Design a protein around this ligand. Sequence first.
Ligand SMILES: *C(=O)[C@@H](C)O[C@@H]1[C@@H](NC(C)=O)[C@@H]2OC[C@@H](O2)[C@H]1O[C@@H]1O[C@H](CO)[C@@H](O)[C@H](O)[C@H]1NC(C)=O
Length: 610
Amino acid sequence: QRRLYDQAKAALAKGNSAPYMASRSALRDYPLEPYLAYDELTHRLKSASNEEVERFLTEHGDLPQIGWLKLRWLRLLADRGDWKTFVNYYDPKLNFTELDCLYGQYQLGHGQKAEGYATSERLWLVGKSQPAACDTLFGLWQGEGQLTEEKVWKRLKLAAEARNYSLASHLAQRLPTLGNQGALMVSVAQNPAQLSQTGRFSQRDHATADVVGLGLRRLARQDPEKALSLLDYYSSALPFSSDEKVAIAREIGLSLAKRFDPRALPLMTQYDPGLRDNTVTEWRTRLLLRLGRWDEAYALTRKLPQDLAATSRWRYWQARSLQLAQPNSKEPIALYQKLAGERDFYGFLAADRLSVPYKLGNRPAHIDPRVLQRVRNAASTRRAMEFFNRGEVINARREWYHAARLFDRDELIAQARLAYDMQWYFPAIRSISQAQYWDDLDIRFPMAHRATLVREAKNRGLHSSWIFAITRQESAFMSDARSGVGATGLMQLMPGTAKETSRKFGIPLASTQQLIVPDVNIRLGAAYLSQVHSQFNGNRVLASAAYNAGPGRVRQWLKDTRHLAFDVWIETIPFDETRQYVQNVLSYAVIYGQKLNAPQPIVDWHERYF
Ligand SMILES: *C(=O)[C@@H](C)O[C@@H]1[C@@H](NC(C)=O)[C@@H]2OC[C@@H](O2)[C@H]1O[C@@H]1O[C@H](CO)[C@@H](O)[C@H](O)[C@H]1NC(C)=O
């Protein structure tokens, strides 16, 4: 019928369970009933019998919030001494470090000393403060002779690496012999530039060596040139392990290569000649590309490990560095041909270099109504559906995403399809991407808000495919989206950005989250996108980067370029986050170009050189 399950929820949270227990034998086949049962038990969890709690975990263990129940209950079991029941339910894959520490205490008092020592050390060697449960465990562990000075040192190092200096200080204060070097590590980690005083860091011991290494690795981010000099001084003076040298050379090398300093190359080739560190390898090739050394880059692309050599990235650059190295050769044509015909950034680049059409290849998946039944029938789906029908979208979403953690490949797809058909564009993308079914472009590149995005595109003189693409990358059409920093809406405008474009364009001010309304957000984001578009001479490559990383950062990455090819520039963007953002947005815009019947090449003629 029309179940007023809200009475029970209104009574229970917060108050009493009288209407719930009246109704419990009425809402048998209501999908949300177990949320009521969950709260009724949770309010009285501290007096509930093991049996009743175990029964609830057996029969409703698929609920999203079951993890919070298991944590609250396992904590009580341990705090009462009921270790046999604790151990029967302790799951390490809940990733509650509080529980992991209790399990360690279990192990040390039930004859698993080797295992409890291993558990203890695993939780010791982190650079952050652990829960109170772990104090007890570190107590026992220390108590049994295990917390040696090396292990205190190793944790000091992690804590200082993590910038937890209060913890680092307390750990230096617990070193029987190395408290001098320990305070130095905290000092140097706070201000690694003191390493320039080479006479204060002269003592030939592992400890001082380790202090110096941490400092150089830190210094590398801010001032790699300075780090390199001091490395040049200290490498003949202190007894660095070869592991420590390699970790120092890595941070200095990468930080030098990110600012296009060819001093990186020799350093990178000595300390990782086998190409074992993928991040070093990619950045050596990147640097050779930025410096115009095509021969060396081609050579390098031929040695890549099989995981990098197989990416569309290094297949493209092998072909391109070759074509740039030997412009009269016919071998890049056949490498490009293998690669055009894929639907990704580098596939399109390859297509572009052969000047053949991009291959989209839209094929909706092939799911039998058999597999579709399982997922529409699933209790988790039924709950999500009933949650969605009432406005409870956070709950619906929480259901949908928790279901997917166990779903196989075929179901995930069926899941995706179901979400699509409800205008639940973001969940459908999440589902299908998790299935790794990339060829369903109907689902992965939806056309929400089509009339508004195209109107606002044409008023600002922007290609509409570009405004879809920015949108798609920014929020995947989750229209009420809010980021880890406060950017709101479809185009993820910050609140200062929105009021500053409103002013500039005489568009009406938005209440700082009236940005949630599509038609208001798209109007401001389009205007603002046109502002960065015109600020970089209509270049979408540069403007896309600006939108993600700010105009100042992009202007640093453009000096001193002269006649720098767009693909090299994209590839040598220092930040992984924005390299990918740019490649995505460009790629998406191509795809939206075909769906809007407004064809859009991966880059325009005027974008190919800056
Ligand atoms: C999924 O593939 C990831 C990498 O993409 C994110 C994702 N949200 C989170 C929290 O991971 C979701 O998919 C569409 C976007 O929402 C995407 O987030 C956006 O990431 C860019 C940087 O690449 C930020 O400028 C956006 O603010 C961020 N948006 C949100 C709502 O988190």
